[PDB]
């Protein structure tokens, strides 16, 4: 019938972990026959499919591992250790600490508002700071047919450039080479993250 191999190490139940670190819970037990171990989160069955990242289970070592913890991992985790003769259990309470994110913050290139001659090169610069992963786009206001706006809220725009930043700080650039009359107009650096959107406008006249 099941028992803890070190019952004294089983007194501690509360764990706080900063986000993106790894948590391991153990319930080292013994019995004859050697018992089963299964894991519950908030009293329900707990499976890899219940978090993104999955779980790593290690029955011989009586362990549940969760890599890269996030706030949604907060809660109660119970091991149920069982053979035919009996049952024991242990519940851990996990807190996960993470800073709250903000909307992106943009900074324009000091030239922006510009003028240039036919055939010359123009470059717009946009510094994007974002504590949550941003989608960064350079856009251009177009005109489908006298539509410097659209039957809605909604200036018409096409997307010149797009990427997802891998870092909190990005220096994003738009290069307009060998400029023609065509290239004159209003340009936007836009940055969107989970929390929201920021943008700056840049003008060219050729």
């Amino acid at each position: 019938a099941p028992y803890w191999t070190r019952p004294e190490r089983m007194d501690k139940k509360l764990l706080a972990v900063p986000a993106a670190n790894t948590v391991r819970f153990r319930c080292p037990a013994a019995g004859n026959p050697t018992p089963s171990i299964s894991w519950l989160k908030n009293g329900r069955e707990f499976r890899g499919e219940h978090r993104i990242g999955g779980i790593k289970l290690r029955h011989q070592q009586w362990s549940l591992v969760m890599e890269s913890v996030v706030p949604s991992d907060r809660g109660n985790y119970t091991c149920v250790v069982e053979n035919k003769f009996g049952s024991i259990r242990q519940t851990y309470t996990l807190d996960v600490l993470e800073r709250s994110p903000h909307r992106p913050i943009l900074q324009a290139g000091l030239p922006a508002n510009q003028t240039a001659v036919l055939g010359s090169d123009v470059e717009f610069h946009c510094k994007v700071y974002s504590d949550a992963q941003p989608h960064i786009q350079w856009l251009k206001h177009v005109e489908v047919n006298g539509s410097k706006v659209g039957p809605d809220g909604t200036p018409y725009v096409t997307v010149l450039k797009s990427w997802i930043s891998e870092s909190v700080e990005a220096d994003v650039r738009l290069r307009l080479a060998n400029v023609s009359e065509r290239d004159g107009g209003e340009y936007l650096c836009r940055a969107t993250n989970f929390i929201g959107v920021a943008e700056k406008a840049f003008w060219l006249s050729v």
Binding site: A20, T22, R24, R26
Partner: peptide, 15 residues
Amino acid sequence: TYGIYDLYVDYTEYV
């Protein structure tokens, strides 16, 4: 470098 947090042991493994 991240840590492995585990109440069963007196260390935090750094990885």
